């Protein structure tokens, strides 16, 4: 979408709204991490015995 | 009968002139509206069937 915007053909909102969508979807994947993390504190030693 | 065509003929002279501006004005707009079609098949939202009818 962005270099449509460039010119004037492609409405100023739709474009800020895509931006949101691409800020969204980076902090739930950072979410995502941080429970990954989360649980791997308590495995880390490596060894099952 | 003179009288009436004389008034006649000058009034459609001024529609026409009206006329023309009204189709130049709609001009603009297609290419515009083309310009758009064209440039979102070029970044790859469109298809080429929008083009053509564009």
Known sequence: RVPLGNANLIGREELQHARDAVTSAQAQL???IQQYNANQA??????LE | ???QTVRSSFNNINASIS???????????????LD?????????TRTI??????
């Not at chain 2, 758009?36 to 790859?44: D, F, I, P, R």
């Open chain 2, 1 to 3: 009968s003179v009288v």
């Open chain 1, 42 to 47: 308590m495995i880390l030693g490596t060894k």
């Open chain 2, 36 to 44: 758009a079609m064209e440039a979102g098949y070029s970044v790859g």
């Open chain 2, 49 to 54: 069937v929008d083009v053509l009818d564009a």
């Open chain 1, 30 to 32: 950072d979410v995502a």
């Open chain 2, 19 to 33: 006329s023309i501006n009204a189709y130049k004005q709609a001009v603009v707009s297609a290419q515009s509206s």
